[PDB]
Amino acid sequence: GRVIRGQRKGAGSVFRAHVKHRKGAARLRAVDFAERHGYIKGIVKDIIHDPGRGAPLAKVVFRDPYRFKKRTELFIAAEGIHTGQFVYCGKKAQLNIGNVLPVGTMPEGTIVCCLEEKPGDRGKLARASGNYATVISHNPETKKTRVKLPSGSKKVISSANRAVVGVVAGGGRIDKPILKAGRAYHKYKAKRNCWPRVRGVAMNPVEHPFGGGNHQHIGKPSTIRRDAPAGRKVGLIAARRTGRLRGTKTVQ
RNA sequence: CCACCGGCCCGUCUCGCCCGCCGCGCCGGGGAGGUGGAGCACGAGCGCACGUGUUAGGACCCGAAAGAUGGUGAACUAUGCCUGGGCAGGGCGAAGCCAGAGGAAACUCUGGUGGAGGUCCGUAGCGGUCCUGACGUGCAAAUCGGUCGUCCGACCUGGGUAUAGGGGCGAAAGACUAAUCGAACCAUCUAGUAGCUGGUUCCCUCCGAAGUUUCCCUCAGGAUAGCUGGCGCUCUCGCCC
RNA sequence: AGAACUUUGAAGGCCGAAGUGGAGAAGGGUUCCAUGUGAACAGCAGUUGAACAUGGGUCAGUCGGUCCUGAGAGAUGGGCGAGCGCCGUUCCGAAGGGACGGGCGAUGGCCUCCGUUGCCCUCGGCCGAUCGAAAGGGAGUCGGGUUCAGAUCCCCGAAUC
RNA sequence: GAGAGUUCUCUUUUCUUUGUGAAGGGCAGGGCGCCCUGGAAUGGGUUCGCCCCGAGAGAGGGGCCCGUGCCUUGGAAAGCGUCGCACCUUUGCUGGGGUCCGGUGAGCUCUCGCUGGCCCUUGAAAAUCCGGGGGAGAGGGUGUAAAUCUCGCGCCGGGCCGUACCCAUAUCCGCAGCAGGUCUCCAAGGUGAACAGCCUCUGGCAUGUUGGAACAAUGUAGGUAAGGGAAGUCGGCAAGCCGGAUCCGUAACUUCGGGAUAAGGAUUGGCUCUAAGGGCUGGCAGCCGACUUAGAACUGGUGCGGACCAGGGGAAUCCGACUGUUUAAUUAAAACAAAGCAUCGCGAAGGCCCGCGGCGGGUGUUGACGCGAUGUGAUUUCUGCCCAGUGCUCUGAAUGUCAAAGUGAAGAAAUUCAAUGAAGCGCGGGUAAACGGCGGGAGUAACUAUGACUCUCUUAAGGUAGCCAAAUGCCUCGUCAUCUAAUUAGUGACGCGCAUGAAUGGAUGAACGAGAUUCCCACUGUCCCUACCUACUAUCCAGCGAAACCACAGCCAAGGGAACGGGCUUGGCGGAAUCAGCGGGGAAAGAAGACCCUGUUGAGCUUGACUCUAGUCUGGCACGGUGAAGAGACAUGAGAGG
RNA sequence: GGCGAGCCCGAGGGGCUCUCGCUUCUGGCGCCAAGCGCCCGCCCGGCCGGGCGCGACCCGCUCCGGGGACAGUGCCAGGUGGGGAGUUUGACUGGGGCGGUACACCUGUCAAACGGUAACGCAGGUGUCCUAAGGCGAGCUCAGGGAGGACAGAAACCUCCCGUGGAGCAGAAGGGCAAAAGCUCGCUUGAUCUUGAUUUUCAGUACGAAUACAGACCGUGAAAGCGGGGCCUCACGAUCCUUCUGACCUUUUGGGUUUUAAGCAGGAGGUGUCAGAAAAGUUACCACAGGGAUAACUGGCUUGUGGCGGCCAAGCGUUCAUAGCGACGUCGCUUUUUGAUCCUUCGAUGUCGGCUCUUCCUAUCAUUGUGAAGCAGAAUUCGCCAAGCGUUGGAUUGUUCACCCACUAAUAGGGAACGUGAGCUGGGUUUAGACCGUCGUGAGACAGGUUAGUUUUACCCUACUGAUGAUGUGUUGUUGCCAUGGUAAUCCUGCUCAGUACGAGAGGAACCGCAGGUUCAGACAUUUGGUGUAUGUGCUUGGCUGAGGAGCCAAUGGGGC
Ligand SMILES: [Mg+2]
Ligand SMILES: [Mg+2]
Ligand SMILES: [Mg+2]
Ligand SMILES: [Mg+2]
Ligand SMILES: [Mg+2]
Ligand SMILES: [Mg+2]
Ligand SMILES: [Mg+2]
Ligand SMILES: [Mg+2]
Ligand SMILES: [Mg+2]
Ligand SMILES: [Mg+2]
Ligand SMILES: [Mg+2]
Ligand SMILES: [Mg+2]
Ligand SMILES: [Mg+2]
Ligand SMILES: [Mg+2]
Ligand SMILES: [Mg+2]
Ligand SMILES: [Mg+2]
Ligand SMILES: [Mg+2]
Ligand SMILES: [Mg+2]
Ligand SMILES: [Mg+2]
Ligand SMILES: [Mg+2]
Ligand SMILES: [Mg+2]
Ligand SMILES: [Mg+2]
Ligand SMILES: [Mg+2]
Ligand SMILES: [Mg+2]
Ligand SMILES: [Mg+2]
Ligand SMILES: [Mg+2]
Ligand SMILES: [Mg+2]
Ligand SMILES: [Mg+2]
Ligand SMILES: [Mg+2]
Ligand SMILES: [Mg+2]
Ligand SMILES: [Mg+2]
Ligand SMILES: [Mg+2]
Ligand SMILES: [Mg+2]
Ligand SMILES: [Mg+2]
Ligand SMILES: [Mg+2]
Ligand SMILES: [Mg+2]
Ligand SMILES: [Mg+2]
Ligand SMILES: [Mg+2]
Ligand SMILES: [Mg+2]
Ligand SMILES: [Mg+2]
Ligand SMILES: [Mg+2]
Ligand SMILES: [Mg+2]
Ligand SMILES: [Mg+2]
Ligand SMILES: [Mg+2]
Ligand SMILES: [Mg+2]
Ligand SMILES: [Mg+2]
Ligand SMILES: [Mg+2]
Ligand SMILES: [Mg+2]
Ligand SMILES: [Mg+2]
Ligand SMILES: [Mg+2]
Ligand SMILES: [Mg+2]
Ligand SMILES: [Mg+2]
Ligand SMILES: [Mg+2]
Ligand SMILES: [Mg+2]
Ligand SMILES: [Mg+2]
Ligand SMILES: [Mg+2]
Ligand SMILES: [Mg+2]
Ligand SMILES: [Mg+2]
Ligand SMILES: [Mg+2]
Ligand SMILES: [Mg+2]
Ligand SMILES: [Mg+2]
Ligand SMILES: [Mg+2]
Ligand SMILES: [Mg+2]
Ligand SMILES: [Mg+2]
Ligand SMILES: [Mg+2]
Ligand SMILES: [Mg+2]
Ligand SMILES: [Mg+2]
Ligand SMILES: [Mg+2]
Ligand SMILES: [Mg+2]
Ligand SMILES: [Mg+2]
Ligand SMILES: [Mg+2]
Ligand SMILES: [Mg+2]
Ligand SMILES: [Mg+2]
Ligand SMILES: [Mg+2]
Ligand SMILES: [Mg+2]
Ligand SMILES: [Mg+2]
Ligand SMILES: [Mg+2]
Ligand SMILES: [Mg+2]
Ligand SMILES: [Mg+2]
Ligand SMILES: [Mg+2]
Ligand SMILES: [Mg+2]
Ligand SMILES: [Mg+2]
Ligand SMILES: [Mg+2]
Ligand SMILES: [Mg+2]
Ligand SMILES: [Mg+2]
Ligand SMILES: [Mg+2]
Ligand SMILES: [Mg+2]
Ligand SMILES: [Mg+2]
Ligand SMILES: [Mg+2]
Ligand SMILES: [Mg+2]
Ligand SMILES: [Mg+2]
Ligand SMILES: [Mg+2]
Ligand SMILES: [Mg+2]
Ligand SMILES: [Mg+2]
Ligand SMILES: [Mg+2]
Ligand SMILES: [Mg+2]
Ligand SMILES: [Mg+2]
Ligand SMILES: [Mg+2]
Ligand SMILES: [Mg+2]
Ligand SMILES: [Mg+2]
Ligand SMILES: [Mg+2]
Ligand SMILES: [Mg+2]
Ligand SMILES: [Mg+2]
Ligand SMILES: [Mg+2]
Ligand SMILES: [Mg+2]
Ligand SMILES: [Mg+2]
Ligand SMILES: [Mg+2]
Ligand SMILES: [Mg+2]
Ligand SMILES: [Mg+2]
Ligand SMILES: [Mg+2]
Ligand SMILES: [Mg+2]
Ligand SMILES: [Mg+2]
Ligand SMILES: [Mg+2]
Ligand SMILES: [Mg+2]
Ligand SMILES: [Mg+2]
């Protein structure tokens, strides 16, 4: 009869993201004439650590092509850039690490990251630390571009959206074991209040469909369909196949 | 007034025949027999008052576990966030560094330095294992004395702030949410219902029981019959039957 | 009048600086001080008291609030809602009323010269009103003396924003 | 130097005090990742530690910032101890000494600066203010003087609000002057490693809502006890032993880090000594002061951590890796959590959720090394077999069932019939680190049995590797061996194990458990077997003074009785009022039994119990408009076919 | 626009088709226009102050992109939906649940010679079957047995005889039936219509079943007659709704026709909890109103069971029934076991065991005095009067119980609300946490196992223990009796007896006497040991009084006496 923990997550009362010490949203520059009919050069001031994120944030200063003012943007620092390196943003920019340019111009097999789903989405895909997307196809007519995302999915996107070249800095971040609960607590304290993660079979039937019984067992098939109501989707959600995997999943 | 027989009216079943025409018809009316009616067969009701009995009203009085509506609480406690404060002393000795010795080389060994740890003894702080110690109408609606675990941390704490009741919060004890939490508090519905307990106030006189039949989701109950009381009413003795 | 509980002196002791000391914040609101009585309150008593009655006591440019935002709360634009209203805070808004300068015109002061008013031209992103800390940010006062009760406040002297 | 205390004896002795605020200037001191000359290796100068050098080291010469330190204006005339002249509601003023000479320090507190370490933790914004780049503009124009001044002065103003006191074992909350709770600063001397414990100074206090007399039992705290030493008890419960430091010695096991203060030994006082461990001045010598170590001699009735302070230990089993959290007010755990190991969904018109409402909100200042939902729970090795059933998922309008809406037909119409049929269901495949499961007979070894081996029914497969009378075994106090004089206990082994078993996790397993259990050593009043002593009661008195409970009240035996009387019957018998204990009775008090049953009385929870619903997936109707190509059916006239 | 690149024709050049402009070694700056061509007012054709355009091109109907007649929105329909909400969890019952239906209907007994009469009393049944197993009429007689006949046999078929029901009548039983109610044969649906009254449980209500009639149409036999189901006792169902049948019926609302609907009567579709709701489980997290109408304690009635005795005497006992046992049978006591019933207790009697302590019982283990043996002695066994005195120390278990070691004269059995929780302990049972095994999909359950889990109050009355007292003797004191009540002593070892009696030996006593010892009781401190604050004395740690001396403080500082 009581709302479960996974159901209380959507209320946003105490489960809000700790966004106090966040430096800024990681987004690219706005598409304009100086970007679609040439390129502009900017200077990287410094890279900083964003709490709750493994990818560093590089501050880049560009010169406004219309007003006398310097524009500061926060990009995702690709691995292999240093303070003082000139970063070029535009259509006819040279293919180098750090420079952003539309995917319709780069050749096949280009390892890029921080791209956009739609032209103007301003850097939404492949933003985690050490991830990249691989361009595999091109279409001159009916402009489309096939990319392979870090999840292995091959998605077709527009040929006008941009992507910075290179892999995100901070790779291999998951190779280190947390090695104790204190480091996990300090990690999740900057992200959000979701760490304790009490098992469902430990509590009572009032707070979870799995709790109860004199023996700490589930009693019901953990595989639950997609049509289950709120507060009922627990355990595996529409598990098409369970158990230890045998090779590659190869699912589209 | 009682019992019976017969008679009349209405609804039905059987049997057959007769009469009428503002129009000669799957139109009307009539008889003799058997049944059903809360009927007729010289009518007694109406209005007011009183008494008893049943019933609906909170309905002889007092009493729930619960349900709904609308509002108040995060000054305790649980959890986030923001902004501040605090944690005596000793023990073990991680990386790195220096020097010396051994060795053909690889390299090894030794003495220091170095000061890491969700490290150890231990104070303040934070909690409360045992004595199942004292109190147990107490200092106290949860305290006190020894003995305890941890004490650089997943640490303790102040103020501000967010989440409000089938909701919040929960390192999960269904624990906490203002001494109340397996669903808070406040007011109303509400004099909620109870086949269940308790109580139910002056005298005298007369009569005076039942715990049994049948039925009911009936077995701690009710209906029915029986037992009882009251109001009468219709007659009979009172002057060889 | 009344003495073990008040006062003074002496002796013997405790708290022994993580106090039984000196100050503060929250909270209390006159409890602080002086005088006076002793039925009630103080778990016995009382000449005593934080009780009673009367009268006093809190003085700031430089102590803090007032200013600023933090987590967060919040009106208008707009949307929803039968409705009190609610969600939403930059979203779907014609959401800058101010200024540098120049020109025209009017007015006032000793109309020499300046200060204003009305209009025209040029320029000007609010990161959206507003609230949110007596421990955060936040310019600038220290020494001595003074009362029965005040001290960085009162007086003297010396400074500063 | 001033004042004070002791002086039977000694002590130039002991105690209190001995000053410079904001602001401005100068000078010491500290820091520099700041400049110039010149460039090194035989590498250099440097820290407690690192660090730095051709991108310029050592050395020499300069600059900048803080200067809370020193002197000076303030500043000695105020302030404070001293000996005095008027004076006891007129009390001010005298003069001397205070701004005297110094030193040391792993000393405590505060501050400043340098450097290092910690990370899947990067540790706040805004208001005010300043500097720089740019050069739109303004200014007298010359032996007369303007544009501007962030320079030295001078004038004026700074409004409003709070300001006492407690801040506490007596001014706050807890019904109160309640051993309870409540956030901060300052904090000395001795012992001592220390803010441990104990004793004093500055400063407070009457012993915590009363005193007098006595020291009976019982009680509450405290300490000993001859001989035995756990023989008491369910249990070593409580109590008791060691407890600090220095010097030797430290096992099994292990993840090689630990175990570990393992275990087991020796010393510890007092007063005289010796040696070592430093700085400063001059061209190897002279003075100045801190307490540390080591050794030896002498000596006290073997006493020396002399009070206080303060780890019993070892051998094993079970569980949990550990640190951490947990039921405020009966549980601290084996429970929860934890890193680690796996699985599932999601590429944003998305996944999981909130919401009565909006293309409203959380994750999201987010993008697969992310988010959301589960299981197991250090490391190592292992992860066995079953998709039959219940769940999850995927596919072809070949294929059954199938609602509205739409089409055709019959009928005067309502209406009826028929054709087609979206999801879903049904069919088929996959998935068990999804829920779960893992049987039963018969014949066979030259002593025999048990049984190598084999045949057969069953459904989806018949317990593999492991482990055990376990926290899991009814029979059971299972059998064997050890531990004991004796063992329902403990350990090891045996294993058709009613009913162990593999992420329902199984087997191990160093360290750690205020976790449960067994044994051994020292230890003690737990005991044999009790006794004595101290403080506070209890006791009597002075003063003040309730509550629980109360049908009337209280001596027993037997009988009957509602089957256990105190009162009834028969007997025993029966003198007031009282004090201190006592706990046999009053079927004693605290509560309309939390146990069992009834109620056609409720609540929490679950599901393949009944009836519904948010939500979610599909189909139809409008928003919802234009063009091309193509498929199926209906009606039309005509040509082939059975 | 060529400061550019072209594929081409081509002598100069042209554009069919096109790339398009000028920021990529470097942690610097970059804005509020230079120039050019024109237009004004002021210095005689000049200076100063201003304005426009090009620089920086023109035109246009979405600000730029990505989807798009889809997605989404409103309405409707169908799936899924304990995520959420509401409600239910039959009754009887020797407590409840499980078991069973004694819940609806029959047969026999219970049932006591009318009818009626109960239990979870006994022995059994029913929810069907039959177009014949109904009706009529006729014919025949069955089960079994005896004697014969080819295969033929215990049983094949034929014939004779006996054959009162011993067979059959659909099925459980009872009653009934012989030219029959049984078997066979032939026609047949009277197993069809209609209105009443009556019988059975009965309230004399209904349903079901049944009886006798009456009114029409039929069957059958020739006929009298029989038949409106089964030879009789059971074989079955209200309201509302649905369906069917009949009128040449009634109403369909202002009046007509028709479809439809409603209406009358009787047949069916069911209430098996059967006089008829539509209904799963758990709560050890539990709550409320009650019940001793109703279990888990004790007590009380009986003792089946348990224990303890007696009688008979077949036999054991080498002989021999009864020294000692004593079967087959049978008669008694006990509530120290369990069980049966539920009488008091539900506004509570605190429910295991252990520790401490008192008293009682005897069915006597030992001790005192005795009798009998297969009692030579010793050691033993069976009884008598006999409860005065004892009936222990430990290992494991919560244990009652049970086993073991050792001691001992003996290590006997019990009662007092299964004595004793305002005396204690909390070891287990028996709350809430949690683990394992089994069961259940689940919540959860287990007289299955293992861990941690608040033990409250006396100051009242009585009883008991002790102390003041009271009554009466005129007052007081001293010395004295006891009526009454209590009552305390018990056991064992060593020596002489005595290596004697006895006994073939082995072995081996007893009375008197002498030393003692165990338990218990009364005291007592000379000696020994405890206690110790005479805070008695003398050392000693830290601090303090200036230092010696004398001292004090550290909750009686510690320790030697
Ligand atoms: Mg967990
Ligand atoms: Mg739980
Ligand atoms: Mg649930
Ligand atoms: Mg199961
Ligand atoms: Mg009421
Ligand atoms: Mg309800
Ligand atoms: Mg509400
Ligand atoms: Mg709070
Ligand atoms: Mg630690
Ligand atoms: Mg250790
Ligand atoms: Mg502590
Ligand atoms: Mg405590
Ligand atoms: Mg506590
Ligand atoms: Mg405990
Ligand atoms: Mg206690
Ligand atoms: Mg007490
Ligand atoms: Mg401790
Ligand atoms: Mg410890
Ligand atoms: Mg520790
Ligand atoms: Mg509700
Ligand atoms: Mg509470
Ligand atoms: Mg409610
Ligand atoms: Mg009432
Ligand atoms: Mg009845
Ligand atoms: Mg009558
Ligand atoms: Mg005094
Ligand atoms: Mg003192
Ligand atoms: Mg301090
Ligand atoms: Mg203090
Ligand atoms: Mg006074
Ligand atoms: Mg008083
Ligand atoms: Mg006062
Ligand atoms: Mg007053
Ligand atoms: Mg002033
Ligand atoms: Mg201020
Ligand atoms: Mg709002
Ligand atoms: Mg509006
Ligand atoms: Mg403000
Ligand atoms: Mg002053
Ligand atoms: Mg003051
Ligand atoms: Mg100064
Ligand atoms: Mg110093
Ligand atoms: Mg003040
Ligand atoms: Mg207090
Ligand atoms: Mg306190
Ligand atoms: Mg000190
Ligand atoms: Mg020292
Ligand atoms: Mg006193
Ligand atoms: Mg007090
Ligand atoms: Mg002793
Ligand atoms: Mg001794
Ligand atoms: Mg010993
Ligand atoms: Mg022992
Ligand atoms: Mg035991
Ligand atoms: Mg202990
Ligand atoms: Mg060993
Ligand atoms: Mg060890
Ligand atoms: Mg010397
Ligand atoms: Mg643990
Ligand atoms: Mg917590
Ligand atoms: Mg506890
Ligand atoms: Mg979203
Ligand atoms: Mg693991
Ligand atoms: Mg497996
Ligand atoms: Mg399959
Ligand atoms: Mg249609
Ligand atoms: Mg054989
Ligand atoms: Mg096996
Ligand atoms: Mg083992
Ligand atoms: Mg033992
Ligand atoms: Mg199993
Ligand atoms: Mg098994
Ligand atoms: Mg001792
Ligand atoms: Mg009596
Ligand atoms: Mg009795
Ligand atoms: Mg009696
Ligand atoms: Mg009584
Ligand atoms: Mg009487
Ligand atoms: Mg009487
Ligand atoms: Mg008394
Ligand atoms: Mg008592
Ligand atoms: Mg009751
Ligand atoms: Mg009932
Ligand atoms: Mg509840
Ligand atoms: Mg567009
Ligand atoms: Mg429900
Ligand atoms: Mg019942
Ligand atoms: Mg009779
Ligand atoms: Mg009869
Ligand atoms: Mg016949
Ligand atoms: Mg029969
Ligand atoms: Mg018969
Ligand atoms: Mg007839
Ligand atoms: Mg019935
Ligand atoms: Mg229920
Ligand atoms: Mg629970
Ligand atoms: Mg009864
Ligand atoms: Mg009973
Ligand atoms: Mg009681
Ligand atoms: Mg009692
Ligand atoms: Mg006796
Ligand atoms: Mg008892
Ligand atoms: Mg227990
Ligand atoms: Mg329990
Ligand atoms: Mg002889
Ligand atoms: Mg002889
Ligand atoms: Mg004695
Ligand atoms: Mg003596
Ligand atoms: Mg002595
Ligand atoms: Mg002494
Ligand atoms: Mg001394
Ligand atoms: Mg001395
Ligand atoms: Mg003290
Ligand atoms: Mg002593
Ligand atoms: Mg002694």
Swiss-Prot record:
It is found in: Cytoplasm. The keyword Metal-binding does not apply. One of its GO terms (molecular function) is structural constituent of ribosome. The modification (3S)-3-hydroxyhistidine is found at H215. One of its GO terms (cellular component) is cytoplasm. GO terms for biological process: cytoplasmic translation; translation at postsynapse; translation at presynapse. Residues 206-231 are annotated as: Disordered. Component of the large ribosomal subunit. The ribosome is a large ribonucleoprotein complex responsible for the synthesis of proteins in the cell. HAMAP family: Ribosomal_uL2_A. NCBIfam families: PRK09612.1. Component of the large ribosomal subunit. Interacts with CRY1. This is Large ribosomal subunit protein uL2. It comes from Mus musculus.
